[PDB]
Amino acid sequence: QSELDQLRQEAEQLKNQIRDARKACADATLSQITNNIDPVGRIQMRTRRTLRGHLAKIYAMHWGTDSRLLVSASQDGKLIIWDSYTTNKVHAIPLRSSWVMTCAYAPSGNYVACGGLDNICSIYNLKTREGNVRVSRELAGHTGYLSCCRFLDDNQIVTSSGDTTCALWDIETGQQTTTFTGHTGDVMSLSLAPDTRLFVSGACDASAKLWDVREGMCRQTFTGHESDINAICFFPNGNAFATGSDDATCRLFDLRADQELMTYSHDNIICGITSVSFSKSGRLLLAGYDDFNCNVWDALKADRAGVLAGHDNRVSCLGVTDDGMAVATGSWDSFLKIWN
Amino acid sequence: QRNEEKAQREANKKIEKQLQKDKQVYRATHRLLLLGADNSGKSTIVFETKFQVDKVNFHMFDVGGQRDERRKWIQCFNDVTAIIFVVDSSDYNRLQEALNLFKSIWNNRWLRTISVILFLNKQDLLAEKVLAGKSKIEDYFPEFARYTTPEDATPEPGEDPRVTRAKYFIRDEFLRISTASGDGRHYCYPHFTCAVDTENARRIFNDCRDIIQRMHLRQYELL
């Protein structure tokens, strides 16, 4: 038992030298780079179309591949895929588990997914059954609630859960292909990489963990928050990670420099952050708060780019299109809004 | 092509007809999240169990199988019309966990407006435990000395005054947690029951009626 204590002290002295080493690679700050950069200053957006028709709150939404179709996830059961150009519904899929929590969209536009509280990630087929859309593949196997699901390829699906597991799944067998354990709290959201080789996971542990897709071990473990990690999304190349917390502190972490680059807090903000997903540029971050309004922040220059208000209740999920032509927010008043 | 837009408009009208049926179906049923301590008579109080009283169908949504944490999936239950609680009024070793829990359900951020009902369950076991007199409430609760029976207490004939004093102390303890931050928006209706009677669904129907009447009267500012 004493050698396990020596093991713990060995761990402590080693991460002491590592956390002192990580400071050694960072002598300047990000504030010394925003001195010769032309800021945006003010920018605002006019609401274009409001997709209405849901009966209870909107919990998550996912953008399409062509940036025309989106998929919306009500909490009365309905999973409705909309065409955002003509402002019209394409399909309305009733469900088994009413309490959905996150949906996603295929890279080929063929399949959708439904993460539930009833512990079964269902996968639905769309374009091969234009009539009578039924449940294609159930993905039972978790114990806790499933909290975020995406599509790696059209055969591979990355589902995070509540029992800390965060497993990678294969549709053809219905079996847990690769498990990524290591956490000790509720894991809330995932965000896939461009190369589909990495992915970043934020949990209740106030920590982010960057994982490979193949071996299955934690490569990186970032920290620095004082509460839950409530959503993450990150840069289009795979070297900078934007993290939204419950302490209202948006953070921008680096993979190459390995340390937390940017913090953002303010004094007028005591509401926690529900979703952060940001633009094709390295300028705009988009945050959603519990004060019922979206806040567009500028990345390198920590100043208010703008406020997108207009919701009746808490914003629950956010989405930027692939081509940047729109920004959609979905709040707890059953009204999606598209902004450009 | 404009004709595929016309087929899209016909499918849109069919989908809007689908949503109109399910709007009437969803507004018909009243969700009721039921959570409570385990081994506290939870299941016999009538996942999803649907029961009908007077042509109204309540979808009592018990939650089980999740790990022992709230505050990530308890924020998903803020559109329900009640929150049924069930606690054990006999086992005094778990009253303090229940008191801290229902203090946390009262003062959470997104469950402010949702008004809990209270089912004190296993009632005659409390009567047996206070007739036998093996363990006192003063061993756990040091506040039982400075308390007497309330006047609105309805004593059961053939039951001791120590029975009524102990039971109404537990009820007044829960209500003393209630009235500290309750602002007239959400109330806590207590109820004593055993595991034997099947009259409880009538009482849930009457008190869900009271919650919806008070919700409609707060919109017109009359009350």
């Epitope: 106030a206 004082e226 509460s227 005591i270 | 944490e69 709230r70 505050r71 966990e97 946390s104």
Partner: nanobody, 128 residues
Framework: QVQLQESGGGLVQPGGSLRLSCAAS????????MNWVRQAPGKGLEWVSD????????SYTGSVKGRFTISRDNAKNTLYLQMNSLKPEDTAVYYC?????????????????????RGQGTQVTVSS
């Protein structure tokens, strides 16, 4: 970055007095709740005492009413729990536990199988 360490413990004769001190670093200490939660062997987790963000509302619960008293130091990032008149049943491990979110009147930390914001704690025992 959030770290919590604890100090005190040992064997103390029944009738003794002890001072449990919890030191935490990595956050802003002054703006949310604090709880003191003990672990008895053979049983689960049981919650002992609570203090608010300033020291305004304090409540002790169970059979530790009056004989114990807690307070806190905002500027030194510290929790104090002064205990008098111990017993054989207070043989326990003692963890200082934290509210999960700032500016809340709610707290679910005690009856957790695992949690993310409480330290590994001290051990108090009595002689017999």
């Amino acid at each position: 970055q959030v770290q919590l360490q604890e100090s005190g413990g040992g064997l103390v004769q029944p009738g003794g007095s002890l001072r449990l001190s919890c030191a935490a670093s990595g956050f802003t200490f002054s703006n949310y709740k604090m709880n003191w939660v003990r672990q008895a062997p053979g049983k689960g987790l049981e919650w002992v005492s609570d203090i608010s963000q300033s020291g305004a509302s304090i409540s002790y619960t169970g059979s530790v009413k009056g004989r114990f008293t807690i307070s806190r130091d905002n500027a030194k990032n510290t929790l104090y729990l002064q205990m008098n008149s111990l017993k054989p049943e207070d043989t326990a491990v003692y963890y200082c536990a934290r509210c999960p979110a700032p500016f809340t009147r709610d707290c679910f930390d005690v009856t957790s199988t695992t949690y993310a914001y409480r330290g590994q704690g001290t051990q108090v025992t009595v002689s017999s």
